[PDB]
Design an enzyme around this catalytic site. Structure first.
Site, PDB file in Angstrom:
ATOM      1  N   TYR A  14      -8.665  46.016 -18.555  1.00  0.00           N
ATOM      2  CA  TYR A  14      -7.459  46.061 -19.397  1.00  0.00           C
ATOM      3  C   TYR A  14      -7.719  47.085 -20.463  1.00  0.00           C
ATOM      4  CZ  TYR A  14      -8.008  41.872 -16.799  1.00  0.00           C
ATOM      5  OH  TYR A  14      -8.292  41.019 -15.755  1.00  0.00           O
ATOM      6  N   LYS A  55     -12.071  32.570 -17.650  1.00  0.00           N
ATOM      7  CA  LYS A  55     -13.205  32.326 -16.725  1.00  0.00           C
ATOM      8  C   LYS A  55     -14.164  31.206 -17.239  1.00  0.00           C
ATOM      9  CE  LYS A  55     -12.634  37.225 -16.737  1.00  0.00           C
ATOM     10  NZ  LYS A  55     -13.204  38.438 -17.404  1.00  0.00           N
ATOM     11  N   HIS A 102     -17.116  46.538 -22.034  1.00  0.00           N
ATOM     12  CA  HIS A 102     -17.183  47.029 -20.686  1.00  0.00           C
ATOM     13  C   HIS A 102     -16.709  48.469 -20.587  1.00  0.00           C
ATOM     14  CE1 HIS A 102     -17.266  43.293 -17.866  1.00  0.00           C
ATOM     15  NE2 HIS A 102     -18.467  43.575 -18.368  1.00  0.00           N
ATOM     16  N   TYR A 103     -17.522  49.343 -19.963  1.00  0.00           N
ATOM     17  CA  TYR A 103     -16.996  50.665 -19.689  1.00  0.00           C
ATOM     18  C   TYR A 103     -16.611  50.751 -18.241  1.00  0.00           C
ATOM     19  CZ  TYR A 103     -15.102  55.299 -19.907  1.00  0.00           C
ATOM     20  OH  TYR A 103     -14.275  56.390 -19.785  1.00  0.00           O
ATOM     21  N   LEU A 104     -15.397  51.171 -18.217  1.00  0.00           N
ATOM     22  CA  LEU A 104     -14.230  51.118 -17.426  1.00  0.00           C
ATOM     23  C   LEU A 104     -13.819  49.663 -17.395  1.00  0.00           C
ATOM     24  CD1 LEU A 104     -13.246  53.913 -17.268  1.00  0.00           C
ATOM     25  CD2 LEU A 104     -12.973  53.583 -14.823  1.00  0.00           C
ATOM     26  N   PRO A 105     -13.068  49.295 -18.463  1.00  0.00           N
ATOM     27  CA  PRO A 105     -12.584  47.921 -18.572  1.00  0.00           C
ATOM     28  C   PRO A 105     -11.440  47.652 -17.586  1.00  0.00           C
ATOM     29  CG  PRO A 105     -11.637  49.209 -20.305  1.00  0.00           C
ATOM     30  CD  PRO A 105     -12.495  50.146 -19.526  1.00  0.00           C
ATOM     31  N   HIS A 152      -7.077  47.738 -23.538  1.00  0.00           N
ATOM     32  CA  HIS A 152      -6.861  47.235 -24.894  1.00  0.00           C
ATOM     33  C   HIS A 152      -8.215  46.644 -25.250  1.00  0.00           C
ATOM     34  CE1 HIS A 152      -4.337  45.418 -28.193  1.00  0.00           C
ATOM     35  NE2 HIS A 152      -5.520  44.842 -28.401  1.00  0.00           N
ATOM     36  N   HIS A 158     -11.584  44.962 -26.112  1.00  0.00           N
ATOM     37  CA  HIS A 158     -11.989  43.569 -26.112  1.00  0.00           C
ATOM     38  C   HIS A 158     -13.465  43.434 -25.936  1.00  0.00           C
ATOM     39  CE1 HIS A 158     -10.653  44.600 -22.173  1.00  0.00           C
ATOM     40  NE2 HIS A 158     -10.807  43.407 -21.598  1.00  0.00           N
TER      41      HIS A 158
HETATM   42  S1  LIG Z   1      -5.589  39.934 -14.514  1.00  0.00           S
HETATM   43  O1  LIG Z   1      -5.371  40.488 -15.792  1.00  0.00           O
HETATM   44  O2  LIG Z   1      -6.021  40.793 -13.483  1.00  0.00           O
HETATM   45  C1  LIG Z   1      -6.615  38.559 -14.610  1.00  0.00           C
HETATM   46  C2  LIG Z   1      -6.926  38.081 -13.343  1.00  0.00           C
HETATM   47  C3  LIG Z   1      -7.623  36.893 -13.214  1.00  0.00           C
HETATM   48  C4  LIG Z   1      -8.030  36.205 -14.333  1.00  0.00           C
HETATM   49  C5  LIG Z   1      -7.754  36.699 -15.598  1.00  0.00           C
HETATM   50  C6  LIG Z   1      -7.049  37.894 -15.772  1.00  0.00           C
HETATM   51  C7  LIG Z   1      -6.845  38.439 -17.164  1.00  0.00           C
HETATM   52  O3  LIG Z   1      -7.251  37.500 -18.163  1.00  0.00           O
HETATM   53  C8  LIG Z   1      -6.352  36.583 -18.640  1.00  0.00           C
HETATM   54  C9  LIG Z   1      -5.046  36.442 -18.219  1.00  0.00           C
HETATM   55  C10 LIG Z   1      -4.178  35.618 -18.915  1.00  0.00           C
HETATM   56  C11 LIG Z   1      -4.597  34.902 -19.997  1.00  0.00           C
HETATM   57  C12 LIG Z   1      -5.938  34.999 -20.438  1.00  0.00           C
HETATM   58  N1  LIG Z   1      -6.311  34.239 -21.519  1.00  0.00           N
HETATM   59  C13 LIG Z   1      -7.609  34.275 -21.897  1.00  0.00           C
HETATM   60  N2  LIG Z   1      -7.982  33.492 -22.914  1.00  0.00           N
HETATM   61  N3  LIG Z   1      -8.577  35.020 -21.315  1.00  0.00           N
HETATM   62  C14 LIG Z   1      -8.221  35.786 -20.283  1.00  0.00           C
HETATM   63  N4  LIG Z   1      -9.206  36.500 -19.712  1.00  0.00           N
HETATM   64  C15 LIG Z   1      -6.858  35.846 -19.742  1.00  0.00           C
END
Ligand SMILES: *S(=O)(=O)c1ccccc1COc1cccc2nc(N)nc(N)c12
Lengths: 288, 287
Positions: B224, B158, B219-222, B226, B228
């Site tokens: 992903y 982002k 973040h709570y309720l992240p 894993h 971070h």
């Molecule tokens: S997804 O996981 O839902 C998602 C959707 C939109 C944007 C990002 C993501 C997850 O984040 C990333 C995906 C792949 C690579 C990556 N690399 C970095 N450096 N940061 C992020 N945030 C992500």
């Protein structure tokens, strides 16, 4: 078609919002202020463009995910330009965005540095008292618990026009005097805190037909004025102030007091201060 | 260079915020999601333009006057993110849905949330690829390779990296299995301290940005599961920096130093999309 002035000279960048893709520039012309804002994407043009071979530059690739740099045609490259000429010091004052710095204040930092510093200043809160004794904004009171000790007044924020619930913003001011901030809170304030939370939410529900789960109920650490007040805002309404560096949920404040009576007197609070604020330097000096 | 797909066919506009100058598009390419975001202004590149005669179109006038500016190729950058292939749960993720608040007690997590989570959540392969250097190796800002207390500091997807105003870095821990805040116990203190300290010192070295200019949170309720940590510029009203989701790292550490069982026993507050099955599950459980 052209500038209402002959030549620009950037003196200072007033404000910028990286989120809102906007910049505010102060410049000496021939004083003028120039606002530049990126335009929102037009659904149609963007769809049309993506369904045709564009100019892309792969930033990086990672699994199913890939980022690029797109250069679209003239149409999709519009920039909103607002020019304020002439602009005085008071015109610059409204767009003045001060650099914020973060600080972690311990209980001892508050007692030794913060508390004496705020005691040195005479921050008058007469406008607050006028609200509480109905000398002002009586017509705006949504709900009141008149208890001198556990009571409060629920008034909608003046910035809220009340014509939509999308930006619902209300403020509960306690009747009791002397609770300057979060630091003054002990278990004795639990009945007052529980009323602000429960009575306040039940009032929003009755008056505005807005369920509690649509509400964000918080306190500010390092508040704008030092007489306890709680904010009731619509969850969908995002604003600086609702941020983690300043907001403290009432439900959480209550639960902390239920667990540790001495919580807010002893625990280390995190907040932001303007770089030019003397309290910032005072705490920095004290912490080294 | 070319896109990773065989043409696009817009099926639905997932999200479109005029405020954030961003659009989320679903298209049949097979399924693909394309995110387009307008870039923040680069102070110098704009100061270079305004000191030269531009192409303006007067809209209105009064001290106020509105214009339409058409800048050169450089100032016409657009952030493009492509998700190919994309699932139904991927499409659900970008839908503009009403948010509801919930207060999850320790027992609510154990009985409702944890089994729901365990039923299945997102593939986190992009995370693993970063950690094992199969992806974005050239982008790593710092790495502590310790399998247990180690991490990887990388600029988040982002962030375009062309300005410090919106500095958004993420620290991803090397250790697997710490899904969220709920999994945290005193054994994670060296890891958490290592992210807080080493992460901030890496931002300082690389971006010459002092820690007092940084907001460091979980973040709570992240999104992903894993662990971070987000490192954001204080001046940036970052998505998810709100009290209903963000938890400061310094505070997470101090809570564990005070109450070992804090995150397993205490009641956490967060928002969920009205259409989320976990929301209904917790509501049903709480009555
Ligand atoms: S997804 O996981 O839902 C998602 C959707 C939109 C944007 C990002 C993501 C997850 O984040 C990333 C995906 C792949 C690579 C990556 N690399 C970095 N450096 N940061 C992020 N945030 C992500």
């Amino acid at each position: 078609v052209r500038l209402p002035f002959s030549g620009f000279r950037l003196q200072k960048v007033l404000r910028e919002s990286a989120r809102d893709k906007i910049i505010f520039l102060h410049g000496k012309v021939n004083d003028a202020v120039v606002i530049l804002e990126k335009t929102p994407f037009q659904v149609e043009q963007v769809a049309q463009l993506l369904t045709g071979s564009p100019e892309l530059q792969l930033q990086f690739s990672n699994d199913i995910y890939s980022t690029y740099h797109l250069f679209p045609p003239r149409q999709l490259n519009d920039v909103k330009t607002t020019v304020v000429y002439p602009a005085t010091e008071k015109h610059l004052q409204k767009y003045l965005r001060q650099d914020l710095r973060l600080i972690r204040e311990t209980g001892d930092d508050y007692r030794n540095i913060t508390l004496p510093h705020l005691e040195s200043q005479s921050l008058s809160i007469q406008w607050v008292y006028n609200i509480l004794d109905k000398k002002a904004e009586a017509d705006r009171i949504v709900f009141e618990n008149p208890d001198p000790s556990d009571g409060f007044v629920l008034i909608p924020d003046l910035k809220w026009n009340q014509q939509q619930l999308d930006d619902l913003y209300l403020i509960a001011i306690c009747h009791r005097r002397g609770i300057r901030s979060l630091r003054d809170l002990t278990p004795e304030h639990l009945p007052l805190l529980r009323n602000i939370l429960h009575q306040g939410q039940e009032a929003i529900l009755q008056r505005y037909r807005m369920k509690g789960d649509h509400l964000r109920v918080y306190l500010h650490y390092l508040p704008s004025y030092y007489h306890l007040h709680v904010h009731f805002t619509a969850l969908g309404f995002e604003a600086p102030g609702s941020g983690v560096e300043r907001a403290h949920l009432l439900a959480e404040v209550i639960e902390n007091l239920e667990c540790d009576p001495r919580h807010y007197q002893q625990r280390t609070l995190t907040f932001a201060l303007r770089a030019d604020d003397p309290l910032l330097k005072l705490l920095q000096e004290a912490q080294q």
